[PDB]
Amino acid sequence: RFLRYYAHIWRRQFRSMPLWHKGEKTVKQPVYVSDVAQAIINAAKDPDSAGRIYQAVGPKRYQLSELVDWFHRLMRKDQKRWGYMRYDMRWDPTFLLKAKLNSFICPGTPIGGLHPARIEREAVTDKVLTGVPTLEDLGVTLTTMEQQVPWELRPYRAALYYDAELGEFETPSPPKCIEARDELRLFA
Amino acid sequence: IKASTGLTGLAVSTNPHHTLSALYGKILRAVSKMPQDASYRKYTEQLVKQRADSVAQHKDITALEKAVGCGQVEELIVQAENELILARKMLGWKPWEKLVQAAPAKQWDWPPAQIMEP
Amino acid sequence: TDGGPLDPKTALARPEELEQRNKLSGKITVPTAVNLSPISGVPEEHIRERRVRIHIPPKNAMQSGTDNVNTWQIEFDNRERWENPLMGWASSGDPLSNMNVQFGSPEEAITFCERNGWRWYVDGAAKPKKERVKNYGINFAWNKRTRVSTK
Amino acid sequence: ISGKTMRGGPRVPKAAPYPYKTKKYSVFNAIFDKTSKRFDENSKVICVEGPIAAGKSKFAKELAEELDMEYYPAVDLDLIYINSYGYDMRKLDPQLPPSCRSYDVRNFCLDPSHDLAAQFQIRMYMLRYSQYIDALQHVLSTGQGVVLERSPYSDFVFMEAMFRQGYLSRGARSVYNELRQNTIGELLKPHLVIYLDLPVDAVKKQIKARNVDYEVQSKVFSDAYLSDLEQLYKQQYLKDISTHAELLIYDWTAGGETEVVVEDIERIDFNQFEADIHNKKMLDWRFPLEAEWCEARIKYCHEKPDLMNYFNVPRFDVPELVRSADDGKVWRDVWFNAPGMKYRPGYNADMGDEGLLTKTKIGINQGI
Amino acid sequence: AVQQVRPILSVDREEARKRALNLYKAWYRQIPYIVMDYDIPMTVEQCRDKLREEFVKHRNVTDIRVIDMLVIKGQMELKESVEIWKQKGHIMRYWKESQDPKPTDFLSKFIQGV
Ligand SMILES: Nc1nc2c(ncn2[C@H]2C[C@H](O)[C@@H](COP(=O)(O)OP(=O)(O)OP(=O)(O)O)O2)c(=O)[nH]1
């Protein structure tokens, strides 16, 4: 509900992406699910890990604006042709109505994973505490987003019926992580 | 003239007597080049005479087939077209020479993998 | 040869192609001590860990026939087995443990093992049994102890 | 394909040959006379080629006799230096300027390095080209196949061999290719090509057997030169034509017998290639409709003058092939005032022709 | 200890060395196509390493006939990969991704068991 919640039709507004503060004040440390599963099992094989707290975070930190730009480059949904553009979610009240309507109408599960509870998850920036063990303590070797995400989004690519010749789509530029010092400035 | 050969993709032959005569004539020339003691030269040279004369001896293809047996005249040609290829090819291999490769030890032994007591 | 047309392929082939067509007929020399481990396709892990025991299969003590020990054999190491959790069968992850091949002499067996990169070690060939007298009359001896008290 | 023994007798034409030497065959002639009605199993083109002095001529004559094929003697410069009335143009050369002096095979074997060699090689290509077209007219109008000694397709080998020995220059080779490219594409490739592979040492011996004055005395027929021709026939010509024409190779049918060769040809089948439409083998001669037959017949019977006007490719940066203006005037004077060159052939009264007052006719596919 | 034998493809180690490099060319040219036409996680740089990693496996091979066979088999896979006869699963089979690492140190193996 993270790489699909941002690739779904509902999340957009005809081509757009309402992000809180354009996502520039949100910093996240997404972790590949397999690494998390490896952590759970490794914690299960070991008794030393009993009765302790573990934080499962990725190796790098990214601004939410930086990530979403990178997806839409991987998805070939670039602004130049496709028409992608980032609102500031505070400006448009239409979006909050969609979630409120969406939650009410659907009996089983919200469509596109969109509902006001999910919105608040997006806004809050990950706060990895210092001194609490991480999966590296459990021996897991974390996979970077660049390794995995480009293969996750292959079935969500736009204009996927093209049969492009080799080179007709240029490899997207990788995302730029946020340095620890930069987070201080980004948050004033 | 046969209406049809009876075999798909095999056409009735015009002047089979000529076509056979040329082919047998060609074979004897290719065979002639082979050394006299070669057993292949002795057999085909003997054989092709037995086929060649029957081709000239008989003028009716139906009578020819009985005189030679060994299939229809169309097939007789098909056969003859081969020994040209064999005889020509075999002037290059020189099979009459001695055994090219002496057999290895136990290379034709059956059943295999038994201790042999000297 | 004879008049009959020449083969276009060889007749028209450039002198260079005929030359390499010759040395590919070749008969070049190569050393006879070779290792076929790369092409045999065995996983590399097995080739490094598992020994091969050249041996004659042991005669069945409970029988007098022998024609089932007239070969040399190879059997791999006896890796682990374990009870199957569900039904309790014997289970193993040891494909080569199932294996067995027959040979005529240890020299061939070593030759085969070297050509495939296996590590081997030969059990001592049973020395030919010493001659035994096995006389019947001695069962009834005048002053010797060989006299049998039964019959 | 069907020798006299196979047919048991002489060729029986399907219909009377069209008198292509005397009557033109334009579009309006094609309405009443159709082309396909005359084509037999023997309506094919055969090129009997080989190295220098391999007895091609003798083999062709015998071969063309068995298959009831028309035989076309190999072109020579006598076709340029002997007019119809028989006068020898070469006698006029003392008058002509040196650049326009007559040049022949004799001269090539004796002064191969002379600048007129480049001229001489292009003439041979032009002569073969015209002769080759004449064979096609005979094929298409009579239905009888033709036997040629050397087609224009194989002529570039001699030019290329001469270039390697350095007789020609870069420019002359460049000019030759443009002519060949400009012209070769308009011909129909032969059905069958026969080659007589005489080894290099053999031909050198064989040349001395003819005991032709200039050849034995000459230096051109060296190992290098004769070797170059062998490499060129087999690597460039034969490898290329075999994509279209059936190819038979013999050591020397000139020294061998032809009756065995005819029996080899008849074994070759020419219909298996017909099945696939786009099959390269014998593609040129695959006409779907009767219109296509007539079009090809019209082109060679009625539009040959066009075919022989493509040799006009202007190239003057090459100094060897250019003929100076002052020479041209002098050469024009001598050449066209010779006995029989005053007028078109068949009109020069001083050569004995008569009735010119009441004569109005001119030949078809004739000059001028 | 030498014997006369029939060559496979080449007559000299230098020719064998020449053939092997061509196989490296064709693979190295082909990686960009394989990434596009197979739904697999691996990228060109990762794959181009896998090509280097494995050509190194057969580092100590000496016999020309063995090198010929490796190049015969090596070429066969490339045709089966230049074509897409090999499916998505087979290409990733070159990485053994499913198999997790088995520790090599004695103490870890002992504790883990045989
Ligand atoms: N420079 C040049 N000489 C040619 C060419 N074609 C033929 N010749 C010359 C080479 C020899 O001096 C001489 C050989 O004549 P041929 O090989 O045509 O023999 P010919 O047709 O007279 O009878 P034969 O070949 O024995 O059946 O003509 C050509 O295209 N260029």
mmCIF file of C-alpha atoms and ligand atoms in Angstrom, chain D residues 48 50-61 71 73-76 103-106 108-109 117 120-122 124-125 128 149-151 154-159 162 167 176 196 206-207 210 212 214-215 218 220-221 225-226 229 233 254, ligand 1:
data_model
loop_
_atom_site.group_PDB
_atom_site.id
_atom_site.type_symbol
_atom_site.label_atom_id
_atom_site.label_comp_id
_atom_site.label_asym_id
_atom_site.label_seq_id
_atom_site.Cartn_x
_atom_site.Cartn_y
_atom_site.Cartn_z
ATOM 1 C CA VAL D 48 30.516 -21.495 -71.514
ATOM 2 C CA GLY D 50 36.764 -20.488 -68.454
ATOM 3 C CA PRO D 51 40.346 -19.269 -68.264
ATOM 4 C CA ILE D 52 42.425 -18.061 -71.187
ATOM 5 C CA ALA D 53 42.906 -20.632 -73.952
ATOM 6 C CA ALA D 54 40.808 -23.407 -72.422
ATOM 7 C CA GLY D 55 39.223 -24.566 -75.678
ATOM 8 C CA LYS D 56 35.891 -22.938 -74.880
ATOM 9 C CA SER D 57 35.083 -22.340 -78.549
ATOM 10 C CA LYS D 58 35.462 -25.980 -79.548
ATOM 11 C CA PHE D 59 33.452 -27.156 -76.557
ATOM 12 C CA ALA D 60 30.679 -24.634 -77.196
ATOM 13 C CA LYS D 61 30.238 -25.581 -80.854
ATOM 14 C CA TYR D 71 26.101 -20.775 -80.915
ATOM 15 C CA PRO D 73 31.143 -16.830 -81.505
ATOM 16 C CA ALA D 74 33.100 -14.810 -78.988
ATOM 17 C CA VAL D 75 33.427 -11.122 -79.787
ATOM 18 C CA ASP D 76 36.691 -9.686 -81.069
ATOM 19 C CA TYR D 103 44.483 -1.150 -80.772
ATOM 20 C CA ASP D 104 43.782 -4.888 -80.637
ATOM 21 C CA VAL D 105 44.605 -8.005 -78.635
ATOM 22 C CA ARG D 106 47.898 -8.252 -80.526
ATOM 23 C CA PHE D 108 47.685 -5.559 -75.750
ATOM 24 C CA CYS D 109 49.923 -8.617 -75.592
ATOM 25 C CA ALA D 117 44.555 -0.450 -72.897
ATOM 26 C CA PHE D 120 40.509 -1.614 -75.271
ATOM 27 C CA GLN D 121 38.961 -3.125 -72.161
ATOM 28 C CA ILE D 122 35.824 -0.985 -72.327
ATOM 29 C CA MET D 124 35.284 -5.625 -75.067
ATOM 30 C CA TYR D 125 32.629 -4.943 -72.451
ATOM 31 C CA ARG D 128 29.898 -8.466 -75.287
ATOM 32 C CA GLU D 149 31.319 -18.108 -74.673
ATOM 33 C CA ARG D 150 31.781 -15.106 -72.366
ATOM 34 C CA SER D 151 28.939 -12.933 -71.147
ATOM 35 C CA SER D 154 32.233 -12.044 -66.622
ATOM 36 C CA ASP D 155 34.068 -9.265 -68.446
ATOM 37 C CA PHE D 156 34.945 -7.150 -65.409
ATOM 38 C CA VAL D 157 37.359 -9.893 -64.337
ATOM 39 C CA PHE D 158 39.771 -9.008 -67.129
ATOM 40 C CA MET D 159 39.535 -5.326 -66.252
ATOM 41 C CA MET D 162 44.615 -5.856 -65.611
ATOM 42 C CA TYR D 167 48.268 -1.735 -66.606
ATOM 43 C CA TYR D 176 34.694 1.104 -66.025
ATOM 44 C CA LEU D 196 36.244 -25.173 -67.204
ATOM 45 C CA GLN D 206 48.217 -24.801 -73.058
ATOM 46 C CA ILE D 207 48.819 -21.290 -74.400
ATOM 47 C CA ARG D 210 48.277 -22.753 -79.846
ATOM 48 C CA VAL D 212 50.039 -17.969 -81.687
ATOM 49 C CA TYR D 214 52.132 -12.634 -80.328
ATOM 50 C CA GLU D 215 50.961 -14.623 -77.304
ATOM 51 C CA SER D 218 54.351 -11.700 -75.064
ATOM 52 C CA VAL D 220 51.413 -10.459 -70.219
ATOM 53 C CA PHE D 221 50.518 -14.116 -69.600
ATOM 54 C CA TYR D 225 48.371 -12.252 -64.324
ATOM 55 C CA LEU D 226 46.920 -15.685 -65.048
ATOM 56 C CA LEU D 229 42.033 -14.291 -63.340
ATOM 57 C CA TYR D 233 36.367 -15.954 -61.623
ATOM 58 C CA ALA D 254 37.716 -28.941 -73.873
HETATM 59 N N1 LIG F 1 42.468 -7.555 -72.044
HETATM 60 C C1 LIG F 1 41.465 -8.564 -72.319
HETATM 61 N N2 LIG F 1 41.799 -9.730 -73.126
HETATM 62 C C2 LIG F 1 40.760 -10.756 -73.401
HETATM 63 C C3 LIG F 1 39.509 -10.617 -72.904
HETATM 64 N N3 LIG F 1 38.787 -11.658 -73.286
HETATM 65 C C4 LIG F 1 39.574 -12.455 -74.027
HETATM 66 N N4 LIG F 1 40.782 -11.888 -74.081
HETATM 67 C C5 LIG F 1 42.095 -12.145 -74.680
HETATM 68 C C6 LIG F 1 43.006 -12.873 -73.688
HETATM 69 C C7 LIG F 1 43.900 -13.698 -74.623
HETATM 70 O O1 LIG F 1 44.979 -12.833 -75.177
HETATM 71 C C8 LIG F 1 43.102 -14.080 -75.577
HETATM 72 C C9 LIG F 1 42.487 -15.416 -75.224
HETATM 73 O O2 LIG F 1 41.471 -15.715 -76.129
HETATM 74 P P1 LIG F 1 40.346 -16.822 -75.678
HETATM 75 O O3 LIG F 1 40.578 -17.251 -74.255
HETATM 76 O O4 LIG F 1 38.982 -16.202 -75.802
HETATM 77 O O5 LIG F 1 40.441 -18.134 -76.660
HETATM 78 P P2 LIG F 1 39.449 -18.366 -77.949
HETATM 79 O O6 LIG F 1 38.081 -17.808 -77.661
HETATM 80 O O7 LIG F 1 40.032 -17.692 -79.164
HETATM 81 O O8 LIG F 1 39.330 -19.981 -78.194
HETATM 82 P P3 LIG F 1 39.345 -21.019 -76.925
HETATM 83 O O9 LIG F 1 39.255 -20.221 -75.650
HETATM 84 O O10 LIG F 1 40.625 -21.810 -76.934
HETATM 85 O O11 LIG F 1 38.173 -21.953 -77.028
HETATM 86 O O12 LIG F 1 41.946 -12.957 -75.686
HETATM 87 C C10 LIG F 1 39.156 -9.395 -72.063
HETATM 88 O O13 LIG F 1 38.064 -9.279 -71.630
HETATM 89 N N5 LIG F 1 40.141 -8.406 -71.791
#
